[PDB]
Amino acid sequence: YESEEQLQHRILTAALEFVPAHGWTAEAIAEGAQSLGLSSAAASMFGKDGSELILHFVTQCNTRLTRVLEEEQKLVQLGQAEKRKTDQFLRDAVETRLRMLIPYIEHWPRALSILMLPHNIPSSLSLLTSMVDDMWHYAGDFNWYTRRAMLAAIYNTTELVMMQDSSPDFEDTWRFLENRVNDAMNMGTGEALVQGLMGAAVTLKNL
Amino acid sequence: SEEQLQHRILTAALEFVPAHGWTAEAIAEGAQSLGLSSAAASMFGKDGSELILHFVTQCNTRLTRVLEEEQKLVQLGQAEKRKTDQFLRDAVETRLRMLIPYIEHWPRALSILMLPHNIPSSLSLLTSMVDDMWHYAGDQSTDFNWYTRRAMLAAIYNTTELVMMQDSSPDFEDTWRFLENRVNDAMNM
């Protein structure tokens, strides 16, 4: 039949449809559960914060990421595709990951603040670093700690910048990305990140 | 050594950050204030990173010394051991208050700290600072592993620091309130 495990996943998955309307909240969780036929009474089983829905989404995105990278690795192994240089590969990996945000971009800044709260942080940081380990695994060649920290910082800063980016198809974000990736490959857009941080400052202060 | 003189230029440049920011301009002024030519700034990066990093390590060092003073007060019987949450709220407030004279330029400094080539150093200063606060907090009072304590306190600190950049309240009252809430959050999870 269906485990409780499978049921919750199903609800969270269906709640994503309503995020663009109710945001990352227990409200959207309810509309999800209801679109599945579940009573509003039965729809109560997740924290009013929307954090489980956010974490759900993130892991689903990382799962989607792992699938893409495994497959492109499969082409290399099949001589069907030419291995990319690390710097190029990370830019493609990160872009690929951040484009999954676009359909939800409207409320993503609030979701990010919630990820940053103390009670969500061990979980979200754990997803982040697992994701970063995957990108590095599929890249293929700095010690583990410097690689992990540099890619996570490239990811988060580019993420913040994207939140303020309104150039066509996010040209500016991908530009920022390339600049950061080259900054990391060599070891040494500035203002763009301070508006990013101010944006994040503002969202945090609004709760 | 050449290390000392640089340390001394960097410390002297701090005086000029309020006016010139985390820039070579600051460093040149600093050098000039020690009766050196502005050309001695040539011996540092134009980034601002070395000056910022210098400042951060000085604040962390000064924090350790303050926490050492409070601990000795307790061991004298002149104060009572504070609860973890109260201790963490005080320690974070003490650390962020050092930012105040520099606050106009701190958002740029944060963005520089976050560059990939500053990150190893940046994160390293931050982990030492958090380990240190927990040390003086007394790990005896907590049911979290090293990882949770570290991640939660770093987050409390970074979020409070961000929020402080937007705070126009008198004496950052709103920042301390946010900080209290974040610490309540960590104590409760």
Swiss-Prot record, chain A:
Residue numbers carrying N6-acetyllysine: 83
Binding site for a 1,2-diacylglycero-3-phosphoethanolamine: 148
Tree of life domain: Eukaryota
Entry annotated with the keyword RNA-binding: no
Consequence recorded when altering residue 197 to S: Decreases membrane association by more than 60%
Consequence recorded when altering residue 144 to D/K: Abolishes interaction with COQ7
GO biological process: mitochondrial electron transport, NADH to ubiquinone; ubiquinone biosynthetic process
Annotated keywords: Acetylation, Lipid-binding, Mitochondrion, Primary mitochondrial disease, Transit peptide, Ubiquinone biosynthesis, Ubl conjugation
Modification(s) after translation: In response to mitochondrial stress, the precursor protein is ubiquitinated by the SIFI complex in the cytoplasm before mitochondrial import, leading to its degradation. Within the SIFI complex, UBR4 initiates ubiquitin chain that are further elongated or branched by KCMF1.
An MF annotation (GO) of this entry: protein homodimerization activity
GO cellular component: mitochondrial inner membrane; mitochondrion; ubiquinone biosynthesis complex
Compartments where located: Mitochondrion
Effect caused by changing residue 145 to D/K: Abolishes interaction with COQ7
Pathway recorded for this protein: Cofactor biosynthesis; ubiquinone biosynthesis
Record disease entry: Coenzyme Q10 deficiency, primary, 5: A form of coenzyme Q10 deficiency, an autosomal recessive disorder with variable manifestations consistent with 5 major phenotypes. The phenotypes include an encephalomyopathic form with seizures and ataxia; a multisystem infantile form with encephalopathy, cardiomyopathy and renal failure; a predominantly cerebellar form with ataxia and cerebellar atrophy; Leigh syndrome with growth retardation; and an isolated myopathic form.
UniProt similarity note: Belongs to the COQ9 family.
Subunit structure: Homodimer. Heterodimer; two heterodimers of COQ7:COQ9 come together on the same side of the lipid pseudo-bilayer and form a curved tetramer with a hydrophobic surface suitable for membrane interaction. These two tetramers assemble into a soluble octamer with a pseudo-bilayer of lipids captured within. Interacts with COQ7; this interaction allows ubiquinone (CoQ) isoprene intermediates presentation to COQ7 and facilitates the COQ7-mediated hydroxylase step.
Protein name listed in UniProt: Ubiquinone biosynthesis protein COQ9, mitochondrial
Organism: Homo sapiens
Gene: COQ9
Region of the whole protein represented: 93 to 311 of 318
